[PDB]
């Protein structure tokens, strides 16, 4: 199973304000949808509440501690680990937020697909700081504003150590 975090953030890693997105960025919404269709998506309960309904054409998984919580059109699990355990056969599970889920998922994540907006918004929740020594950039695409803020799509893949790593060429 590949664990992938997808998130949109500003230059300070801000992702949210009052349980809403701090911006409207159509390019990001198109990107997110095209990436997530036909994959299982995992979100925390507040993010589901923010979205307000299941995202169509995808398996919506919601994490909550509330044992008797019912959400039509979503699968409920009582921990991220329980969800990941149930999805063992999936080639890729996409974690879609929010801040609490991202923080918990990051130590298990293999991949990150990040939209980074070149602007500073006002807000209350952030994407977790990742260790730049642990991850390599596999794709970076910068976009000028039109989408009224400039933005980039940055893809990262988790590494494996210079001391122990294999090498591409040998004499
Ligand atoms: N910019 C972006 O890409 C994104 C932004 N957002 C933003 O993030 C914010 C929401 O994030 P946040 O408030 O952190 O909430 P989350 O979306 O991470 O949901 C938190 C809730 O999820 C449940 N939960 C999380 N982890 C566990 C666990 N390990 N075991 C059991 N239950 C768990 C709990 O539900 P319960 O209370 O029911 O027990 C908890 O209150 C919003 O502002 C939203 O707009 C969200 C996604 C992406
Ligand atoms: C498709 O609509 C929404 C999607 C998301 C999650 C999300 C959106 N974009 C990116 N790049 N990563 C994510 N995890 C979060 C939302 O609100 C918190 C949405 O409602 C506007």
Q: Which helix (H) or strand (E) holds 103?
A: helix 99-105
Q: Mapping DSSP to helix (H, G, I), strand (E, B) and coil, where does residue 102 land?
A: helix
| Beta strand spans in the chain (E) | 2-10, 14-16, 40-44, 59-63, 75-77, 92-97, 111-117, 125-126, 135-143, 151-158
Phi, psi of 164 (to 5 degrees): -95, -20
Going by CA atoms, what residue is nearest to atom 21 of ligand 2?
A: 51
* Ligand approaching nearest to the C-alpha of 112: 2
CA 87 to CA 151: how far, in whole Å? Answer: 32
Atom of ligand 2 nearest to the CA of 114: 11
- Domains in the chain, CATH or no CATH each: 1-171 (3.40.430.10)
The token pair at 137 is 């950039």
* Residue of 28, 33, 46, 75 with the most ligand 1 atoms within 8 Å of its CB, for mutation: 46
CA 116 to CA 23: how far, in whole Å? Answer: 12
Ligand 2 center to 60 CA (angstroms): 13
Give 129's contacts (C-beta < 8 A, 6+ positions apart): 13
Ligand 2 center to 96 CA (angstroms): 7
Ligand 2 center to 6 CA (angstroms): 9
The token pair at 80 is 């991220």
140 is in an annotated binding site: no
138 is in an annotated binding site: no
Q: Which helix (H) or strand (E) holds 69?
A: none
109 is in an annotated binding site: no
The total number of residues written for the chain in this structure:
171
Going by CA atoms, what residue is nearest to atom 19 of ligand 2?
A: 51
Ligand 2 center to 115 CA (angstroms): 11
Atom of ligand 1 nearest to the CA of 14: 1
């Amino acid at each position: 199973m590949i664990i992938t975090l997808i998130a949109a953030m500003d230059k300070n890693r801000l992702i949210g304000r009052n349980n809403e997105l701090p911006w409207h960025l159509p390019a990001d919404l198109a990107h997110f949808k095209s990436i997530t269709l036909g994959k299982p998506i995992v979100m925390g309960r507040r993010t589901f509440d923010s979205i307000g309904k299941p995202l169509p054409h995808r398996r919506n998984i919601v994490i909550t501690q509330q044992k008797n919580l019912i959400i039509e059109g979503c699968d409920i699990f009582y921990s991220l680990d329980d969800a990941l355990s149930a999805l063992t056969k999936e080639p890729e599970v996409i974690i879609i937020g929010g801040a609490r889920i991202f923080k918990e998922a990051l130590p298990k994540a293999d991949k990150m697909i990040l939209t980074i907006i070149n602007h500073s918004f006002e807000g209350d929740v952030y994407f977790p700081e990742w260790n730049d020594k642990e991850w390599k950039i596999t794709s970076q695409i910068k976009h000028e504003r039109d989408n009224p803020y400039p933005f980039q799509f940055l893809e990262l893949r988790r590494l494996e150590n210079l001391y122990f790593q294999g090498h591409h060429h040998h004499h």
